[PDB]
Design a protein around this ligand. Structure first.
Ligand SMILES: *[B]([O])([O])[C]([C][C]([C])[C])[N]C(=O)[C]([N]C(=O)C1=[C][C]=[C]C(C2=[C][C]=[C][C]=[C]2)=N1)[C]([C])[O]
Ligand SMILES: *[B]([O])([O])[C]([C][C]([C])[C])[N]C(=O)[C]([N]C(=O)C1=[C][C]=[C]C(C2=[C][C]=[C][C]=[C]2)=N1)[C]([C])[O]
Ligand SMILES: *[B]([O])([O])[C]([C][C]([C])[C])[N]C(=O)[C]([N]C(=O)C1=[C][C]=[C]C(C2=[C][C]=[C][C]=[C]2)=N1)[C]([C])[O]
Ligand SMILES: [Cl-]
Ligand SMILES: [Cl-]
Ligand SMILES: [Cl-]
Ligand SMILES: [Cl-]
Ligand SMILES: [Cl-]
Ligand SMILES: [Cl-]
Ligand SMILES: [Cl-]
Ligand SMILES: [Cl-]
Ligand SMILES: [Cl-]
Ligand SMILES: [Cl-]
Ligand SMILES: [Cl-]
Ligand SMILES: [Cl-]
Ligand SMILES: [Cl-]
Ligand SMILES: [Cl-]
Ligand SMILES: [Cl-]
Ligand SMILES: [K+]
Ligand SMILES: [K+]
Ligand SMILES: [K+]
Ligand SMILES: [K+]
Ligand SMILES: [K+]
Ligand SMILES: [Mg+2]
Ligand SMILES: [Mg+2]
Ligand SMILES: [Mg+2]
Ligand SMILES: [Mg+2]
Ligand SMILES: [Mg+2]
Ligand SMILES: [Mg+2]
Ligand SMILES: [Mg+2]
Lengths: 220, 203, 196, 216, 204, 213, 200, 196, 202
C-alpha cells in the first residue's frame, strides 16, 4: 500500500493506490483505500485491511453521532483523538496505519496515525509499504501553498512512485480533494496499469466439461 | 531523542531535538517534543511516541480539572507528581523518559526528571533521551550556578546540537522554550542557526 | 490405541470397537467398552484423551436422555449428531476443550440408518462407513474395496471381520478383542465379540 | 563477519552519457552512534573503475587491500591488458559468493561504476553474491528513498548528461539526509569518464526546514 | 498451517445476469480423505449462496451461525437479504472473533432479490470484504485458481459459458493440489432457476 | 543467524514442440518488497540446441550457470563434441545433488532439441530430481501457470476436443497469455517477458512488455 | 507415494503410483518410481525424489561394475546390501528413502526393503510410502503365493489404486512390472481416472 | 519393539527373541530373526536402532570368525563378550556410536554355559537370566519368581513360555511369534518357534 | 574503560583510566592500560583484558623483530597495521578496542584507532572504551586545531575525568603519557590532582 496526503493552499489532497495483497499475491486490483470519515474528513488506510475498514467505519459512525448532537461540522482533531485513543487502548494490535485529512472551521489539517496510537500533525505524510518512495517525491518536490492542480500532480506522482517501486503497491491512483468549498473523490484518478491483451481465444464449447449429475431447481 | 531543561532565577528553559524514528527511518523530521501541560508547565518527551502522547494528554486532563477546582495555577511539582504516578504505576507497559518543567508562583522555576521506571527527582538541570549519553561530560564541564535566561538558552542549544550530531536517533531542528511569570516564548533553531562545531580533520 | 469402525447398510448400522484400555506399555483392561447408548436407537462411540472421553460422552448421553424425558420422544440420530457437534465446537476455543474422536450410529423411523464421523475439531460428516484410530489407516481401503450400499448385514459382519483380521496381521498394537453391535428398526443388538 | 561493527549507509550510482557517478556519505556508524565522521567509502580501483561500499567498514578495508593488491600485481606485468569494470564486478561477485558459501560473509553491499571502450558500467554486488547491472543503483535506505527518484527521471529521459546526473544525485543525497537516521551531510561524489576517476569531497547539501513552522 | 489441515477450495464467478459458485467435495484430515461429499456451499436465499473453505469445523460453524443471524434478520425485516448486506453481516460475524478467528475465508455469490443484478465477493478470516466484478477464490490452491480464472474469465458470459469456465478453472486448479478435489460441485444462479451439477473429476 | 539465501523472484516456463522448444521468463529481479532491476532475464544459452531457465536465489543462479558453462567446455574438450540436451540434464542433476546438504536455491528448466531434432523439456527440483516433460512452469508464478498449461497443452479435463499437434504459433500465444495472467497476480512477475525459440535453424529471441507495477 | 511388491510362485510383482509433491503442490503426475537397475533387477522409489533417484542410480552403477569385475549377475541380497551400506554412512543427515530391491537370482524370486534409517530386510510382500497403509490393507486381503499371474496383476493394480484414493500424496497412474526368471517386463500403465471408470 | 530373553541352566543357555520388524504403525516382517551366530557355540542377540544393529552385530560376527581363521580355535563366550564390549565402549564417545542393546549366549568346553547382558552404553554383566526391551519390564519378575540355577531345559522352555504368554496378555505390542534356540556342549540347536 | 590520544606538532599524548572490572567488582583499581609496543609507540587498551594483553604482547614481538631486521625505528603506521591485521582476522574471537599512538621520524606524532571489528583510521585525536560515550559532546566542543603538548595533556585529563565520573566501568587514576622525538614522559593524576567539576546541587 501507498497512501499519502498533502496540505495545499486551500485544502487537502489525499492519495492512494488500489492493490490489496494476500501474501505476495494480488487479491484485489481495485481496492478503495480512501475512507469516508465525515463529509469534510477522509482517511486513507494501510496495514491490516479488516482493521482499517472497521476502525474508520466506527470512528465515522461515532462522529456522525457527535455532529448530529452538536449540529456542527466535525473537526479533524476530533477524528484524530478518537482514532488515536482507540488505537492506543489496543496497544498496536489493531493494525491500522492512517492518513487523516480534512477541512473544518479552523482550516485544513492532516495527520498520520500509527497502530500503537501516536500521531503526527504535518503538511505532508505517507504510510504503507510504499511510503518511503512516496515521501521521497514529497521531500524533493513539495512546496508550501500549492495550487490545487500542482498539489494533485504531486500526490499522484508520490503514489506512482510507490506503485512502481513497491511490490505491495499497484494498479490505480485514487485521489480525494477537500477544500472549504468542494469535495472531489476521484476514483480512479489515473489508471497507469492495464492487463495485456488476451492473445488467444480459448472458446470452450458447451459439453467440453463432462457432468456426472444435474438438478434444476426452478424459482418464482 | 535529546531533551533538556535548565532552571534560572525566574523560570526555566527547555529544549528538544525534532526527530521521530521507526528503526532508522525518520517518520517525522520536525517533531515537537515539548508539550504544554498547562499555561506555564511543559513536558519534554522521549521514548515511545504513542506512550508519551497518551500520558501527556491524560495528565493535561487531570491537571486542568484539578486547576479549575482549586481556582489557582497548578504547582509544577503537582504536574510532575501526576506524571510520576502514571509512569510508575504503568512502568511495565510504558516507555517514557520525561522532563517536567515550568513556573508557578509559589516555587518559581522548576525542573523535574521522571525517567523510565517512574522515579521523580528535582534538578537544577536535566537531560534525557538516547542522545543525552553523549552530552553528560559536556554539561558537567559547562554548567555554572547562576546562569541567566540567555545563558541557559545558549547552553541548551549547544548541548542539544552536540547530541544531535552524534546520536543517530536525534536530529532535525532544535525547539526551545523559556517559561517565566510573564509567559512562554518559543523558538526554533534551524539550519545555520544550530550551533556548529568542526569535524576534527587531520592537520 | 483405540479403534472404532462403522458400516451402514440399507436398514441397519453395524459398529465395532476394541476392548483394550492401555496405559504406558500395559493393557490394564481387556473387556473395555467404548460404546455409549444415547437412546433406544443411538450409539455414540468415543475415543481420545483419558478423562475427556468419558466426561464428554456421558454429558451427551445424559442430555439426550433428558431430552427424551422432557419431550416424550427421542432425538433423531441426525439431531443428536448435531447436538454433539454443537457442544464440541463450542468447547473448542474455550478453557475446557474435549480431545475426543467419535462415531455416532443410529436408526431413525423415517430417515433409516445413519453413521456420523466426528473428529476432535468437531467437523461432522455423514458416511456410509468410517473408522477412527491408527487402525483406520489399515482398514479404510478394505472397506473402500468391498463395501456396497446394499451390503447385507451377514456380509457386513464378514467385511468387519476382514478389517479386524488385518489388524491382527499388520497393526503393531495388540488389539485381540472387539465389541460388535448393530442398530436397526428394532433397536440395538449385541453381537458376539470378535476375538483372536 | 558474523556481526557488523562500524558500518556505512547507502551508496548511489547512475550512468550518464560518457561516464558514471557514484556518491556516498563519509560516516562510519557504530550502531546509532555517528562515530567516524570523515571516512571515505569509495575506492578508485584503477583508471576505468571505482567502487563504493555500504555495510561493515573493516570488511570494506579488507576488500580494498585485496583489490588494490590485485591491480598492482596486474600493472607490474606491463602487458597491455587491464581489468575492465565488468571483470572487477565479476571478481567481486565470486569473492562475496565464496565467503557467503563458507558462512562467513564480507558484510557489504557494493556499487561498481566504470567507463571503458565507450560503455558506462554500473553494477551491484551484495554479501550473498547477488549481482546485476542497471542504469541506476542505490543500496541500503537508498533503495527505498533514492532509487524511486532515479528511476522516475530515467524513464522520462534514459540518457542523462553529466551535470544532470550530478544534480539528480545531489537531490537524492538530500532526501537521504532528511530520512535515513544513519546518514550524514558530508559526502563524496566519484565520477568515471574517459579521463579516469575523480573523487570530490567533502561535500554538503543545502537543506530546508520551513516545515518546522507548519505544525498547528 | 491451520488452513491446510482439511484442504479445500471454493470460487465464485460473475457473468451476464448470472453468477456461479463452485467447490471441491473432499473432507480430509491431512493426507487422509475421510469423505467425498462434504458440503461447503450453503444457500442463504433463493438466489444467494456462500461458499466456505478452510478448517472444516469452522466452515460448518460459520455457515450455521450465519444462518441463525440471517433467519432472524429476514423474520424481523420485511424481506430477503441483499447480497451486499449479507457480506456485511458475515464481515461483522468474523470480525467479532478478530483476536481468535474462525479459520474460514468465504465467497458469496448471488443475485439481488429485487433487481437480479449479479454480486460476488470474498472475505478474509477476520472479515475484510472484497467485492469484484469478475471472480473470487479461496482455499489451499488459491494460486492455481487465480491462474485459471485470470486466463479464462471474460466479461458478459452467458450461463453455459460461465459454467464451462468455472468448471474448467476449478478442475484444473484442484488437480495441482494434493489436498483439494475428490469431486467438484457447481451451482449456476439465474433469475428463474438454480442449476446444480457435479463434474466428472479426478479422484486421486 | 546470517542467512545465506534470499528469494529474488522470477518465473520460468518451457514447452516442447515437434520440432521446437520454447524457454521463457520474466525479467524482474526482486528482493523483499523492492525491485533490483527490470531487465534481468532468467534464460541462458548453453549450446545452439539447449537453453536453461533459472529462478530462485540469484546468487545461486549466477554461480550455477557459470558452473554449467565451465562443465560444458570441459566435456567438449574431453569428448570432442558438444553436450546433448539429455546429457546436460543428467549432469545438472549430479551438480545439484553435490550440494544436497547446502543446496543451490534454484529451480531449473532446460528446453532444447533432443538427438532426433524433437523438442525436449527437462525440469528439476533444487537438489537435482528431474524428468522429461512436454511442458513445465517454474519459479514464482508456477502454480498459476501450470494448471492452465495442463488444460490447454495437455488437454486435461476436456471432452470432445481433437488432440492436435502444438503449433509454434499457438505455443507462442499461450506463453504470452499465461505470463500476462501471471503479471496480474504474482507481485514478483512483471516488467518484460523474454522468449527463446530453439529450432534446427538456431535460437531466436522475442520480448513482450508486461505491467511495471 | 505408494509402492508395493510381492513374491509369488511366478516371480515378483512390482507396482507404483506416479505422483510427486512439493508440500501440498502436485509437482508431477508422471514420475517413474520403478527403476531398471539391470534387466533382472528393479528398485522402487519412495521419499525424497532427488535422494531416491541419485542413490538408486548409484546402485545401478555399482551393480554394473560388480558384474563386469566378477563375470556374473549380482544377487538381490548383495545388491540390496550395497545400497544399505551406502546410505548407512548418511544416517541422521536427513536423507529420506524407502526402496524395494526386486529380482530373481540363484535363490529364486528376491525382495528386500531398504531405507535411509538403515533397515534392510527380506520379505514376501512390502508396501512403502505415505500410501502404504492403504495398499497393505488391500494387498494383504488378496495375497497368496499361489496367485495366478493375471490375479497378481489385478491385486497390485487394485492396491495402488485404493491407496491413491485415500492418500492425498499418491496419484497419477499405476505402473506395474513383473520380475520373471529371464527378466522383468513392464506389464501396464493405467491412469487412476481410467481405473476409476473400470472399478465402478 | 524388540524383545530378547535368555535363561542359563547348568549345562545350556536358552534364548529367544521376537520375530517382528516394525515401522511406524505396521509390522513389515513377521519372521524376523534377531540372533547372529558368532561361532559354533556363541549367539549374539541384538536390538536397537535401525542400521546400527545389523552393522554392529555383523562387524562382531566377521571379526570373531576371522579370529577362528587366524588362530584355528574359537573365542570363548567370555572373550567374545569382552571383545564386543571393547568395541561398543570405544565407539561410545566417537563420531560413530552404535545404539544397540545385546545379549551374548555361549557354551565353553571348560567354563560351561554363559549369558551376558550389555546395554548401549557398553556396561557388561554376566547373569543367570536377562532380557531386553519394554517386554523385559513385564517378564524379569516372572523369571525372578520361578528360575532356579539347576533348572532343566524342559522347564526353562516352560518358563520361557510363561514370559511370552505374559506379553500376549499384558503388553500393548503385538508380538505373536518368537525364535527359540539353545546352546550346549553340542552347539546351537534351533527349537520350534513359540507362536500365538 | 576510557582511553584517549591526541596528536600535537612533534608528538602525541595518551591517557586512560585505571579500572578493571568483573561484573561490577573492581579487580584492579590502578590498571595500566597504556602499554609500550616499541620505544616511541604505545597502545591504549579497552575491552577484554585477556585479549588485549595477548594481542599487545604478540604485536610487541612482531614489531621488535621487524625493527631489528630493518635496523630502523618502526613506523607508527606499521604498529597500527599489525594490530589491525590481528584484530580484523580474529574479530570473531576478540573483544579489543585499541588506540595506537606514537612518534616516528618520518611522519611525527600519529594517532590511529582500531575499534572492535578491526578497521583502522588515522585521527587528530581518538577516544574509546565504554566511557567514551559520555565525552563525545565535550571533546567535539573543546577540541581546537593546533593545541600544544601541555594543552593536549589538560584536554586529555579533563575528558578522562568527566568520563570517569559518569561511567561505572571507568575510574581510579588517570595515567597519561606524552611521546615525542625526545622520548616518553609518563605521569599519574590521582586523588585531588584529577580535574574536578561540581555535582549540580539545588
Ligand atoms: B526519541 O525518544 O528518540 C523519540 C521521542 C518521541 C517522539 C516522544 N522517539 C521515537 O522516535 C520513537 N519512535 C516511536 O515511538 C514510533 C513512532 C511512530 C511509529 C512507531 C512504531 C512503533 C512500533 C512499530 C511500528 C512503528 N514508533 C522510538 C525511539 O522508536
Ligand atoms: B512419494 O514418496 O510421495 C514421492 C516419491 C518420488 C521419488 C517423487 N516423493 C515426493 O513427491 C517428495 N517430493 C520431493 O522430493 C520434491 C518434489 C518437488 C520439489 C522438491 C524440493 C526439494 C528441495 C527443495 C525444494 C523443493 N522435492 C516428497 C513428497 O517430499
Ligand atoms: B575497560 O574496557 O572497561 C577494561 C580494559 C582492560 C583492562 C584492558 N576492561 C575490563 O575491565 C574488562 N574486564 C576483564 O576483561 C576481566 C578482567 C579479569 C577477569 C575477567 C573475567 C572474564 C570472564 C570470566 C571471569 C572473569 N575479565 C571488562 C569490561 O569485561
Ligand atoms: Cl489530537
Ligand atoms: Cl502496507
Ligand atoms: Cl530529524
Ligand atoms: Cl529515562
Ligand atoms: Cl530520559
Ligand atoms: Cl573519521
Ligand atoms: Cl581510493
Ligand atoms: Cl453467532
Ligand atoms: Cl446480524
Ligand atoms: Cl507415468
Ligand atoms: Cl565390485
Ligand atoms: Cl531379512
Ligand atoms: Cl570499539
Ligand atoms: Cl574503543
Ligand atoms: Cl578504579
Ligand atoms: K510526538
Ligand atoms: K543525528
Ligand atoms: K506483477
Ligand atoms: K590490563
Ligand atoms: K566511575
Ligand atoms: Mg505499549
Ligand atoms: Mg483438557
Ligand atoms: Mg487435488
Ligand atoms: Mg491420492
Ligand atoms: Mg508495485
Ligand atoms: Mg549414528
Ligand atoms: Mg576469548
Amino acid at each position: 500500500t501507498t497512501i499519502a496526503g498533502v496540505v495545499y493552499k486551500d485544502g487537502i489532497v489525499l492519495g492512494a493506490d488500489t492493490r490489496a495483497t494476500e501474501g505476495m499475491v494480488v487479491a484485489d486490483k481495485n481496492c478503495s483505500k480512501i475512507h469516508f470519515i465525515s463529509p469534510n474528513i477522509y482517511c486513507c488506510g494501510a496495514g491490516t485491511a479488516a482493521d482499517t475498514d472497521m476502525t474508520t467505519q466506527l470512528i465515522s459512525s461515532n462522529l456522525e453521532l457527535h455532529s448530529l448532537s452538536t449540529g456542527r461540522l466535525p473537526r479533524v482533531v476530533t477524528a484524530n483523538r478518537m482514532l488515536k485513543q482507540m488505537l492506543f487502548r489496543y496497544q498496536g494490535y489493531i493494525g491500522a496505519a492512517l492518513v487523516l485529512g480534512g477541512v473544518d472551521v479552523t482550516g485544513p489539517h492532516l495527520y498520520s496515525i500509527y497502530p500503537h496510537g501516536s500521531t503526527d500533525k504535518l503538511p505532508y505524510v505517507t504510510m504503507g509499504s510504499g511510503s518511503l518512495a512516496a515521501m521521497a517525491v514529497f521531500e524533493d518536490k513539495f512546496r508550501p501553498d500549492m495550487e490545487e492542480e500542482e498539489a494533485k500532480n504531486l500526490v499522484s506522482e508520490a503514489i506512482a512512485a510507490g506503485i512502481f517501486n513497491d511490490l505491495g503497491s499497484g494498479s490505480n491512483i485514487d485521489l480525494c480533494v477537500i477544500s472549504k468549498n468542494k469535495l472531489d473523490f476521484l476514483r480512479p484518478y489515473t489508471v497507469p496499469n492495464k492487463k495485456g491483451t488476451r492473445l488467444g481465444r480459448y472458446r470452450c464449447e458447451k459439453g467440453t466439461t463432462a457432468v456426472l449429475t444435474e438438478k434444476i431447481t426452478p424459482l418464482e | 531523542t535529546t531533551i533538556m531543561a535548565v532552571q534560572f532565577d525566574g523560570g526555566v528553559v527547555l529544549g528538544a531535538d525534532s526527530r521521530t524514528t521507526t528503526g532508522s527511518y525518520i517518520a517525522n523530521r520536525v517533531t515537537d517534543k515539548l508539550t504544554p501541560i498547562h499555561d506555564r508547565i511543559f513536558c519534554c518527551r522521549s521514548g515511545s511516541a504513542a506512550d508519551t502522547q497518551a500520558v501527556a494528554d491524560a495528565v493535561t486532563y487531570q491537571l486542568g480539572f484539578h486547576s479549575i477546582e482549586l481556582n489557582e495555577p497548578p504547582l509544577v511539582h503537582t504536574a510532575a507528581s501526576l506524571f510520576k504516578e502514571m509512569c510508575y504505576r504503568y512502568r511495565e507497559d510504558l516507555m517514557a523518559g520525561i522532563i517536567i518543567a515550568g513556573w508557578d508562583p509559589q516555587e518559581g522555576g522548576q525542573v523535574y526528571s521522571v525517567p523510565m521506571g517512574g522515579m521523580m527527582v528535582r534538578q537544577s538541570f536535566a537531560i534525557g533521551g538516547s542522545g543525552s549519553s553523549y552530552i553528560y561530560g559536556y554539561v558537567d564541564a559547562t554548567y555554572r550556578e547562576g546562569m541567566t535566561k540567555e545563558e541557559c538558552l545558549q547552553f541548551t542549544a549547544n548541548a542539544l546540537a552536540l547530541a544531535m550530531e552524534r546520536d543517530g536517533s536525534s536530529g532535525g531542528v532544535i525547539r526551545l522554550a523559556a517559561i517565566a511569570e510573564s509567559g512562554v516564548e518559543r523558538q526554533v533553531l534551524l539550519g545555520d542557526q544550530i550551533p556548529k562545531f568542526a569535524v576534527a580533520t587531520l592537520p | 490405541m483405540e479403534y472404532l469402525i462403522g458400516i451402514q447398510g440399507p436398514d441397519y448400522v453395524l459398529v465395532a470397537s476394541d476392548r483394550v484400555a492401555a496405559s504406558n506399555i500395559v493393557q490394564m483392561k481387556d473387556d473395555h467398552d467404548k460404546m455409549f447408548k444415547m437412546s433406544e436407537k443411538i450409539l455414540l462411540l468415543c475415543v481420545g484423551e483419558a478423562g475427556d472421553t468419558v466426561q464428554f460422552a456421558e454429558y451427551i448421553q445424559k442430555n439426550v436422555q433428558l431430552y427424551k424425558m422432557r419431550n416424550g420422544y427421542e432425538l433423531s440420530p441426525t439431531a443428536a449428531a448435531n447436538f454433539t457437534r454443537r457442544n464440541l465446537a463450542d468447547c473448542l476455543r474455550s478453557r475446557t476443550p474435549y480431545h475426543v474422536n467419535l462415531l455416532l450410529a443410529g436408526y431413525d423411523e423415517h430417515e433409516g440408518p445413519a453413521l456420523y464421523y466426528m473428529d476432535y475439531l468437531a467437523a461432522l460428516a455423514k458416511a456410509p462407513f468410517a473408522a477412527h484410530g491408527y487402525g483406520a489407516f489399515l482398514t479404510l481401503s478394505i472397506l473402500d474395496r468391498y463395501y456396497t450400499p446394499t451390503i447385507s448385514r451377514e456380509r457386513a459382519v464378514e467385511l468387519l471381520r476382514k478389517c479386524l483380521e488385518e489388524l491382527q496381521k499388520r497393526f503393531i498394537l495388540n488389539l485381540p478383542t472387539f465389541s460388535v453391535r448393530i442398530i436397526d428398526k428394532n433397536g440395538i443388538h449385541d453381537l458376539d465379540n470378535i476375538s483372536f | 563477519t558474523q556481526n557488523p561493527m562500524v558500518t556505512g549507509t547507502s551508496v548511489l550510482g547512475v550512468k550518464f552519457e560518457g561516464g558514471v557517478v557514484i556518491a556516498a556519505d563519509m560516516l562510519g556508524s557504530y550502531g546509532s552512534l555517528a562515530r567516524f565522521r570523515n571516512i571515505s567509502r569509495i575506492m578508485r580501483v584503477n583508471n576505468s573503475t571505482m567502487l563504493g561500499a555500504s555495510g561493515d567498514y573493516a570488511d570494506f578495508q579488507y576488500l580494498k587491500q585485496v583489490l588494490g593488491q590485485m591491480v598492482i600485481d596486474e600493472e607490474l606485468l606491463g602487458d597491455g591488458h587491464s581489468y575492465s569494470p565488468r571483470a572487477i564486478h565479476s571478481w567481486l561477485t565470486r569473492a562475496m559468493y565464496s565467503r557467503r558459501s563458507k558462512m562467513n560473509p564480507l558484510w557489504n553491499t557494493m556499487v561498481i561504476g566504470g567507463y571503458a571502450d565507450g560503455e558506462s558500467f554500473l553494477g551491484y554486488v551484495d554479501m550473498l553474491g547477488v549481482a546485476y547491472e542497471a542504469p541506476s543503483l542505490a543500496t541500503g535506505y537508498g533503495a527505498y528513498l533514492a532509487q524511486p527518484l532515479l528511476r522516475e527521471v530515467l524513464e522520462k529521459q534514459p540518457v542523462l548528461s553529466q551535470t544532470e546526473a550530478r544534480d539528480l544525485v545531489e537531490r537524492c543525497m538530500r532526501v537521504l539526509y532528511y530520512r535515513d537516521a544513519r546518514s550524514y551531510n558530508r559526502f563524496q561524489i566519484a565520477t568515471v569518464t574517459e579521463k579516469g576517476v575523480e573523487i570530490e569531497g567533502p561535500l554538503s547539501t543545502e537543506t530546508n526546514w520551513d516545515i518546522a513552522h507548519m505544525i498547528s | 498451517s491451520i488452513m491446510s489441515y482439511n484442504g479445500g477450495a471454493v470460487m465464485a464467478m460473475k457473468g451476464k445476469n448470472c453468477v456461479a459458485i463452485a467447490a471441491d467435495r473432499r473432507f480430509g484430515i491431512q493426507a487422509q480423505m475421510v469423505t467425498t461429499d462434504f458440503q461447503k456451499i450453503f444457500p442463504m436465499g433463493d438466489r444467494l449462496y456462500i461458499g466456505l473453505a478452510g478448517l472444516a469445523t469452522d466452515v460448518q460453524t460459520v455457515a450455521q451461525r450465519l444462518k441463525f443471524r440471517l433467519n432472524l434478520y429476514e423474520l424481523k425485516e420485511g424481506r430477503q437479504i441483499k447480497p451486499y448486506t449479507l457480506m456485511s453481516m458475515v464481515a461483522n460475524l468474523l470480525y467479532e472473533k478478530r483476536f481468535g478467528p474462525y479459520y474460514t475465508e468465504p465467497v458469496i455469490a448471488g443475485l439481488d432479490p429485487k433487481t437480479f443484478k449479479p454480486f460476488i465477493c470474498s472475505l478474509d478470516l477476520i472479515g475484510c470484504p472484497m467485492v469484484t466484478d469478475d471472480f473470487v477464490v479461496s482455499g489451499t490452491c488459491a494460486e492455481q485458481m487465480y491462474g485459471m480464472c485470470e486466463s479464462l474469465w471474460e466479461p458478459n458470459m452467458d450461463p453455459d459459458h460461465l459454467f464451462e469456465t468455472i468448471s474448467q478453472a476449478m478442475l484444473n486448479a484442484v488437480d495441482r493440489d494434493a489436498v483439494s478435489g475428490m469431486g467438484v460441485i457447481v451451482h449456476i444462479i439465474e433469475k428463474d432457476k438454480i442449476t446444480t451439477r457435479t463434474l466428472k473429476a479426478r479422484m486421486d | 543467524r546470517f542467512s545465506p539465501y534470499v528469494f529474488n523472484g522470477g518465473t520460468i516456463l518451457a514447452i516442447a514442440g515437434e520440432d521446437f522448444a520454447i524457454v521463457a521468463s520474466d525479467t524482474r529481479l526482486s528482493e523483499g518488497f523492492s525491485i533490483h532491476t527490470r531487465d534481468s532475464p532468467k534464460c541462458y544459452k548453453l549450446t545452439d540446441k539447449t537453453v536453461i531457465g533459472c529462478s530462485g536465489f540469484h546468487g545461486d543462479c549466477l554461480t550455477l550457470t557459470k558452473i554449467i558453462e565451465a562443465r560444458l567446455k570441459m566435456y567438449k574438450h574431453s569428448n570432442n563434441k558438444a553436450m546433448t540436451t539429455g546429457a546436460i540434464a543428467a549432469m545438472l542433476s549430479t551438480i545439484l545433488y553435490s550440494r544436497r546438504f547446502f543446496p543451490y536455491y534454484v529451480y531449473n528448466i532446460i528446453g532444447g532439441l533432443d538427438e532426433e531434432g524433437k523438442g525436449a523439456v527437462y525440469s528439476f527440483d533444487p537438489v537435482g530430481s528431474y524428468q522429461r516433460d512436454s511442458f513445465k512452469a517454474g519459479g514464482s508464478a508456477s502454480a498459476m501457470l501450470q494448471p492452465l498449461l495442463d488444460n490447454q497443452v495437455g488437454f486435461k479435463n476436456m471432452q470432445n476436443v481433437e488432440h492436435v499437434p502444438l503449433s509454434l504459433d499457438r505455443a507462442m500465444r499461450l506463453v504470452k497469455d499465461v505470463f500476462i495472467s501471471a503479471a496480474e497476480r504474482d507481485v514478483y512477475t512483471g516488467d518484460a517477458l523474454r522468449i527463446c525459440i530453439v529450432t534446427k535453424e538456431g535460437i531466436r529471441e522475442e520480448t513482450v512488455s508486461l505491467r511495471k507495477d | 507415494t505408494t509402492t508395493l511388491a510381492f513374491k509369488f510362485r511366478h516371480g515378483v510383482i512390482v507396482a507404483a503410483d506416479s505422483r510427486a509433491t512439493a508440500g501440498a503442490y502436485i509437482a508431477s503426475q508422471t514420475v517413474k518410481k520403478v527403476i531398471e537397475i539391470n534387466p533382472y533387477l528393479l528398485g522402487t522409489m519412495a521419499g525424497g525424489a532427488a535422494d531416491c533417484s541419485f542413490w538408486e542410480r548409484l546402485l545401478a552403477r555399482q551393480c554394473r561394475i560388480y558384474e563386469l569385475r566378477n563375470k556374473e549377475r549380482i544377487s538381490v541380497a548383495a545388491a540390496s546390501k550395497l545400497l544399505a551400506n551406502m546410505v548407512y554412512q548418511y544416517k541422521g543427515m536427513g536423507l529420506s528413502m524407502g526402496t524395494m530391491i526386486c529380482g530373481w537370482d540363484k535363490r529364486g524370486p528376491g525382495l528386500y526393503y531398504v531405507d535411509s534409517e538403515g533397515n534392510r530386510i527380506s520379505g514376501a510382500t512390502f508396501s512403502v510410502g505415505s500410501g502404504s497403509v492403504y495398499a497393505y490393507g488391500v494387498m494383504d486381503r488378496g495375497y497368496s503365493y499361489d496367485l495366478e499371474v493375471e490375479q497378481a496383476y489385478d491385486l497390485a493394480r487394485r492396491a495402488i489404486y485404493q491407496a491413491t484414493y485415500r492418500d492425498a500424496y499418491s496419484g497419477g497412474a499405476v505402473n506395474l512390472y513383473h520380475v520373471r526368471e529371464d527378466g522383468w517386463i513392464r506389464v501396464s500403465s493405467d491412469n487412476v481416472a481410467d481405473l476409476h471408470e473400470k472399478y465402478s
